[model samples]
Target: MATETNYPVPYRSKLTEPFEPGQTLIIKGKTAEDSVRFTINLHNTSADFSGNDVPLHISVRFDEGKIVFNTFSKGEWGKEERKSNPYKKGDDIDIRIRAHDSKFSISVDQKEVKEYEHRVPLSSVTHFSVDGDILITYIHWGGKYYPVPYESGLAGDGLAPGKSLLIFATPEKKGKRFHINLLKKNGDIALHFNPRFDEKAIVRNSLISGEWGNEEREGKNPLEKGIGCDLEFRNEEYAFQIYVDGERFATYAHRLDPHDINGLQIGGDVEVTGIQMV
Candidate 1:
């Protein structure tokens, strides 16, 4: 269907056309302070306005840490499905749903949330609904599709004091892990930022000339597996700053010849849903 953007919270808007593949729905919202539950679902307003043939209904149960999905068809609601809820009240959540060949892929705050199967193929639908104890920032119908494990290069000045790396991703499964390698031209790893799922914390280190440096493991992990995590690695004159969930987490002191390093490599079990380099 057609898309919309920047609408107010706790609001519902009908789509201009039926939903299909190659389309996406972006929902930005914050859970109420005492939120119990919130819902964002799609349905056709026909069928007696009684939820007939409603192919998708997702409910975020804050009280139980569970996400529920179901379909209402043949004048009855189908089996209810559940998943571990990675959402918390008050944190801004970015819920994105994109239609694919056979399923709807969803990402919450850049984490791989869920993939709902296309059981009904939704021929025509009218209205997208948002209800519950939540603040809706907007109900966007479309936006640019950002693929994962994304790559980019440095500027003309190379990796200077102002250079930074931002990665938005989610632990799709428990024990999800990945690495961010700032590379040197001759196949060397300058800043080998690794996040391994040890549950309590992540491990960070570096490698130069194929030799490992002393591991830097200090503070506790600020991210949870199976959920979204925001990471920002900035540059200072001397050390590189690291931030998680918008808060500074750690800093890597410069050791490899001041201002250099060209390419970036991100690969591992975790899905890097978004990236920004400055």
Candidate 2:
């Protein structure tokens, strides 16, 4: 966590690092009765937050049933952008706010919600503070870090008959398609798994020597747009087994060296929350 172990008593602390476009702020807590207004501010720097230049401000008001976003610089506050609230007074809540290229992608309890655009540059934020009617439970700070076309190496023997790769993601509500690729060490893509909602199918193939193999499609649509989707990719002796949302979705036979596929790449219209070697 970048912030200190300060409890919900209206805490303020400098971030260990400055805010980046890919960094995320996750606040898990609950609201209380008579909680009217609370504010989360991203400050560039100041001795006092009450007298600082806030590049970004988030105000949650239970009385209005609205979440307002604005910026306060040099004194006067900017125009507010309002969105419907998704909070209950006595219920436990989980909020994940991700900084994206064009907007702040927010989710409530793993479900996609509203997006707040950057009225002020996101990179200018050097400190963060939260003070509100919410009861604090946990606060975690992390980053998606890698931009689009995200790639990483698979640990422990690469992709073999016994190894598996798991990815946790949530599709964009109005997204069209996204891709996940298993790459060989020589930079070839051993398996290209593309899910297209508009086409109503999942496409599978391999890219060898800069050439693509036959396309395989079946098993219908296994992804639900705007919600969390869990997928596992397994290397089998005969085929590459895949499961989406806990069900077997497709099986594509290995056309390249399965053991050579050591890297994984995923991008396009998805919030990748987790990648694990299983």
Candidate 3:
């Protein structure tokens, strides 16, 4: 019979690569069960597991009653091993479990990685525990995990108009450029780019507005390295615009109707590389 316990604690880290099934993920927390399951999902890719190479021990014991289950393609579900790791520590990671599905799904940096079906129904889980000195960002239970949509204008309640809808910050890594797509409610879209450095202005463009603008700058444009600094564009009817911060240049414009604008996508070659409130 399946036993009851709390949800398992989350473990996060700054990794250079992704995690694969069968390979033990060194986490700081401990679950109060005999077995624990793990799942990984990557953007624009299929899920992989360790069972293809060898049968995995789904359940492990850190102590009594505190057992962990390994449902990721090891004991029963036979799947292939992943070719690469889809996540790094700094990348956004989201996890969710549902008793009805008896499975766990993990999303890394806005991409789905793996899903582990529980051998026992979720009704049996009662005690969830976590340990270690890691940042416990967001936690959810009893519902499905959904990806936050990218928006062009300000997000959340009590937001004032023209109050810096977009925020920019330097990445921990140097020489790396971050790209973002500001999606409009009408299916129209805009692009924004932010690079590492000061004296740089935000760049934007709009599919509907057909107008682009760049932040005012003094001195040498700051894009001397051939990397675009910043640019912006906006549409009249639409509330947002596009931005671009290229490795050697930058540009922006306003958008009126993104759906009517060519090449708009919710899930395609385009991706949100930076952080946003929406």
Q: List the residue pairs that clash in candidate 2.
A: none
Best by lDDT: 2
Candidate 1 global CA lDDT score: 0.71
**lDDT, candidate 3, at 266:** 23
Model 2 poorest 10 in a row by lDDT: 1-10
Worst 10 residues of 3 by lDDT: 41-50
Per-model TM-score, in order, reads 0.57, 0.58, 0.29
Candidate 3 whole-model C-alpha lDDT, 0 to 1: 0.31
Model 3 per-residue lDDT at 187: 42
Model 3 bad stretches (over 4 Å): 1-102, 106-115, 123-127, 132-204, 211-265, 269-278
- Please write out the lDDT profile of model 3 over residues 1-278, one tens digit for every residue: 11213333332122233222221221222122222233321111113221232112222122221223342222354443232333333332233222224344333222334465544333323223233212334332221221233333334421222322222222322333333455544544454343324435433333445444443223233432322112333332445433433232222334342333322222211222223232
Models ranked on TM-score: 2, 1, 3
Considering lDDT, which of the candidate structures 2 and 3 is the better prediction for this target?
A: 2
Per-candidate alpha-carbon RMSD to the true structure: 7.2, 6.6, 14.1
lDDT of 1 by residue, 173-251 (tens): 7555777877767766667777767646566766777888888876877777777677887878788788997799888
Off by over 4 Å in 1: 1-28, 31-94, 98-100, 107-114, 119-160, 171-177, 198-201, 257-260
* Alpha carbon lDDT of each predicted model: 0.71, 0.78, 0.31
lDDT of 2: 0.78
